[PDB]
Amino acid sequence: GNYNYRYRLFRKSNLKPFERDISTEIYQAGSTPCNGVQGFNCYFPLQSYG
Amino acid sequence: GNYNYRYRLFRKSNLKPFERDISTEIYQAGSTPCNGVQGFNCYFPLQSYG
């Protein structure tokens, strides 16, 4: 496995053309806040390719 | 996608029978002490099914 290449899997809105997103904030996919901790309905935005 | 189901992808050694590992420690896959922060050669142990 080469997990050094990552792609952003979760975002609130689509990107404008020629825009980059280097943020690492936890994507809240539920009603409960995440507080920067992964868990139930709180996911890391970047996933490795493998 | 249903990303609430996770599996442990990286571990130092294989598990014993009837043993569980709920620890969330950043697995170092290189020679760099990266202080528990994901990035190059430091991966999260848990990966989502999706």
Experimental technique of record: cryo-EM
Q: Is A32 on the interface with B (CB under 8 A)?
A: no
Q: Which residues numbered 2-31 in A keep a CB inside 8 Å of some CB on B?
A: 3-4, 29
CA pair distance B47, B37, nearest whole angstrom: 16
- One-letter amino acid for residue B32 of the chain: T
CA pair distance A41, B3, nearest whole angstrom: 8
Q: Is A43 on the interface with B (CB under 8 A)?
A: yes
The answer to whether the CB of B48 falls within 8 A of the CB of B3 is: yes
Gaps in chain A with C–N over 2.5 Å, residue before each: none
